[PDB]
Symmetry: C3
Subunit: 114 residues, 3 copies
C-alpha cells in the first residue's frame, strides 16, 4: 500500500518519527507486512480547503484490496487521529481518497503483482 499526505503545515512541524509511525500503523491497519507499506509526506504546500488556508491535509491511500466501506471508515478514524495529534490538523480539514488497486495494475521489482 501507499499513503500520501500533502499539507500546508511547515516541514519543521512534521515530528521526527512520523513516517515510521505511519508505516507501523498502516501495516497494522491494513494487515500487510511493513515491507509493502510506502509513505510520503509533502509539507509546505500551497493549498486551500473550503476556501481557507488554515492547516489541512489532502491524502490518498492505495492498496491491493483491504479497501471497502467499513475498512475505509476505520482508516479515516485512524488517519484523522494521527494527523490531528501529530500535525495538529483538525479532522474536519483532512480529506482522504481511497483506491482499491488490481494486482495487475501495481508494478514492483521489475514486474507486477498479478
Amino acid at each position: 500500500p501507499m499513503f500520501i499526505v500533502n499539507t500546508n503545515v511547515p516541514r519543521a512541524s512534521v515530528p521526527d518519527g512520523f513516517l515510521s509511525e505511519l508505516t507501523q500503523q498502516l501495516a497494522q491497519a491494513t494487515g500487510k507486512p511493513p515491507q509493502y507499506i510506502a509513505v510520503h509526506v509533502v509539507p509546505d504546500q500551497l493549498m486551500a480547503f473550503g476556501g481557507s488556508s488554515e492547516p489541512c491535509a489532502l491524502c490518498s491511500l492505495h492498496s491491493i484490496g483491504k479497501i471497502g466501506g467499513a475498512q475505509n471508515r476505520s482508516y479515516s478514524k485512524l488517519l484523522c487521529g494521527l494527523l490531528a495529534e501529530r500535525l495538529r490538523i483538525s479532522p474536519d480539514r483532512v480529506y482522504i481518497n481511497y483506491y482499491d488497486m488490481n494486482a495487475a495494475n501495481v508494478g514492483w521489482n521489475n514486474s507486477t503483482f498479478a
Copy 2:
C-alpha cells in the same frame, strides 16, 4: 472535490488570488459547495510535455459524481482557460485527469461518505 495542478511555472508567476479563483470557479462548474472543495497548486516542478520543457501543467479533479463526458469537456475548457490566463500555460500543454469517486472511497472528519 479536490483539484490539483502541478506545473513547471515558477511560484512567483502564480498570481495572488489563484486558489480562490479555482475554488469559486470549480464550485460553479461542479455545483458543489465551496466548503467541499480543496485546491492545491504545485509550482516549480521538473516536468516535460511532448518532450519539451516549455510551460505545462498536469492536473487532476476528483469528485463524488459530477464527472462525465459533457461535464468533463466543460471543466477542461474552464480550467485550461484559467491556466492560460493566470499562468500563461498553453491549453495544448495541459492534461487533466478526472476521477468519479465512490462516496465510500472518500474519507473526511473521522468517517467516509458511504
Copy 3:
C-alpha cells in the same frame, strides 16, 4: 500518457536528460507519439518504503489504453530498469500504479479525448 515519479533521491542525483529519456522510452513503450507523453519527476521527497528512508520511488503511469497484464509487466521492467540505472533506486523499492483512463476522463486543450 503521463508518467510521474516521486522519490527521495536528491535533485542533484537526477541526471541531465532524464525527462527526455523517459519521454522517448515511454513513447516507444506505449506506442503513442512523443507529443502526447508528459513526464514529471519529483526529487527530495520525504518518503519511506518498507520502513526505510533508503532510496525509493512511488510512480504512476496513466494512459488511454495500452494498459494490461502483459503490458504492465513490460512497463515495470522498463521503468524499474531506468530508475535503477539512472537514479540508483533498487527495483524492490519502487511502486508503479497503472491507470487505463477512459478518453472522456482525460482533459487536454480545452476539451477531452472522447
